[PDB]
Each structure stands twice: as C-alpha cells, then as structure tokens.
Amino acid sequence: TPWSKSELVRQLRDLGVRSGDMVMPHVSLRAVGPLADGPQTLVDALIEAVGPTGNILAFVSWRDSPYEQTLGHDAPPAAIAQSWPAFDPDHAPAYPGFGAINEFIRTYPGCRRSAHPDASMAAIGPDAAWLVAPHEMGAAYGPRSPIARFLAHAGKILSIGAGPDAVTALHYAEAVARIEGKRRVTYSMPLLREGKRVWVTTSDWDSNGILDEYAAPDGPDAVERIARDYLARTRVAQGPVGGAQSRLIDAADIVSFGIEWLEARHAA
Ligand SMILES: CN[C@@H]1[C@@H](O)[C@@H](O[C@@H]2[C@@H](O)[C@H](O[C@H]3O[C@H](CN)CC[C@H]3N)[C@@H](N)C[C@H]2N)OC[C@]1(C)O
Ligand SMILES: [Mg+2]
C-alpha cells in the first residue's frame, strides 16, 4: 500500500527531524516506493516535519543548463549564444538527474530560487530568502553560496535512499581545502539582468572531481570517498522513510571531516 503523508512524517520524526530544523534532502524516489499522491506526498511530509519555523534547501540546478555545451570555452559558442534561453528562476525546470522530487520542491508555493543557473538551489521556509541569495557565478558550492549559509544554519543532510555520492554540501569542503592541484572549470551561463539575457563566463572548482584522481567519469569522486569513510566512522541516525534506508547527517560535521580528510591526503 502506498505511503501516506502521516506515515512519512512519523518516520522522519523517528529519524530525528525536529520542528524548526534546516534540512537538505537527497532522495531516491525508486527506493521510497509508491506514495499516496506521488512525490508531492514526500514534499508535504518534509514541510510538515520541519514545521512552520523550519526550512528546506535543495540542490535543484536547471534541466537546460548549458554546462557541457560551454565547458572549456572562453565564451559561449556562437550557436549556443544566439538561441539558448536565459535562466528564468520562476520558470526553469529542475535538472532531472539530481532527483525527480526537485521539480516538486521548486514549484511549491513560496519556494525561493537561487540565481546560479547550474548550481541553482531552492528553499522553502522563513529563512528561504537569506538562504538563496547571493548565489553568484564563481561561487557555486563554496564560500558565499547557499551551501555556505546552510552550513552556518545548523543544517542537516537528509539522505533518503541516496548513495554517498549524493552529498552536495561536501563540494564546500573541496572549495576550501588547502590542497595542491585543485581542478577548475570554465563555463558560461545565460542570466537575466533587468529583463535582458546576459551571458556570464566564469571559472569555479570542478564539481566533477576536485583532483585528477577523483575525476573519472564514473567516480568515485572525493564526495563519495569522504562520505563513505565518514559513515563508517560516525554515529548517524538511520531508519526508513517510505521503503528507503535513510540517514540524517550533521552537515557542519561532515564538511569539517571532509576538509580534514582532503588536507590529510594531499600536500598543501
Ligand atoms: C546540470 N549540469 C550538471 C553540472 O552541474 C555538473 O553536475 C555535477 C554532477 O555531475 C555531480 O554528480 C555526478 O557525478 C559524480 C561523479 N563526478 C557522481 C554523482 C553524479 N550525480 C555533482 N556531485 C555535482 C554537480 N554539479 O556536471 C553534470 C551536468 C549535467 O552538466
Ligand atoms: Mg528560523
């Protein structure tokens, strides 16, 4: 029988989600199983679990981000530049590969959306505006991003059947790690500025592998290696949400662990 909102809420409470919490979910809907009213059932349950003073932050990105199409170029290629849609935060759909739940999160009434087209973050709750801005090109997951503020806001990472590769917040550790050989990428995004499309070219840390040895197309990247180690070494509440094995992780703690992990392994 499909899971009801009430059942999910009680499961989230059992796992340790409390009213007022700041939660970043990573969800495998296949692992969760059938829901009474589809993915919205779990969105509603998350909102109810954090309560009217809690907050949700999700890494939603953009279905049509021209990342691969502009990667490595000092300017968007001519055909891309001419016709690509500008990122419109009110209308741009989420990137399906980070989870089908994210399109439901970002369309929730009152959801706020960050301005970085490729790293776009969605937030629901009283602190949503403070979470989502600024989010500038060149600051995807590191200092000054919504992840940085989440990590300062008692954030908890709620992994619902998702693997250790899924922990976006660990890209902050990569950004700040004092290690040699860090990979950077250059790409271009089309933004709206006073109603007009403006192409912005930037560089940032490579979110597909911070060092060469972490950059194989099919991983494991450093996020995955850090998170697997962390979960083998740390008490973390575990339990079901729907049919999915889930975990509730202190975000500041895993990020600090990840900074230390990288700096212990790689010369400065
Ligand atoms: C939406 N554009 C995205 C772009 O943001 C980026 O996405 C990466 C994504 O590939 C990474 O994750 C992906 O690759 C990992 C191995 N490198 C394993 C997990 C897999 N989801 C995330 N950890 C960080 C995102 N910014 O590279 C892929 C892409 C599709 O172009
Ligand atoms: Mg508050």
Residue nearest to atom 20 of ligand 1 (CA): 165
Minimum CA distance residue for ligand 1 atom 13: 208
The number of helices, as runs of H, and strands, as runs of E, in the chain is: 11, 10
Q: Give the whole-angstrom CA distance, residue 168 versus residue 46.
A: 19
Q: Which residue's alpha carbon is nearest to atom 16 within ligand 1?
A: 219
Please report the resolution in angstroms: 1.1
Q: What is d(CA 123, CA 146) in angstroms, rounded to the nearest whole number?
A: 9
Considering every ligand atom, which ligand is closest to the CA of 211? 1
Q: Whose C-alpha lies nearest to ligand 1, atom 12? A: 208
Q: How was this structure determined?
A: X-ray
Q: Give the whole-angstrom CA distance, residue 71 versus residue 91.
A: 24
Q: Write b or e for each residue in 131-158: b if 16 or more Cβ atoms lie within 10 A of its Cβ, otherwise e.
A: bbbebebebbbbeebbbbbbbebebbbb
Q: Is 247 annotated in some ligand binding site?
A: no
What is d(CA 112, CA 90) in angstroms, rounded to the nearest whole number?
A: 9
Atom of ligand 1 nearest to the CA of 208: 17
CA distances from 186 to 66, 92, 140, 189, 218 (A): 12, 22, 12, 10, 21
For residue 28, give the nearest of 90, 98, 117 by alpha carbon.
Answer: 98
The single-letter DSSP state of residue 64 is T
- 120 CA to centre of ligand 2 in angstroms: 22
Q: Strand, helix or coil at 57?
A: strand
Task: Measure 12 CA to ligand 2 centroid, in angstroms.
Answer: 19
**Pair 55, 123: CB distance under 8 Å:** yes
For residue 96, what is the DSSP state? G
Q: How far is the CA of 50 from the centre of ligand 1 (A)?
A: 28
Distance, CA of 234 to CA of 252 (rounded, Å): 13
Q: Could you tell me whether strands 55-59 and 22-27 are parallel, antiparallel, or unpaired per DSSP bridges?
A: parallel
Q: Is 174 in the pocket of ligand 1 (CB under 6 A)?
A: no
Cα 23 from Cα 17, distance rounded (Å): 8
Question: How far away, in angstroms, is 53 Cα from ligand 2 center?
Answer: 5
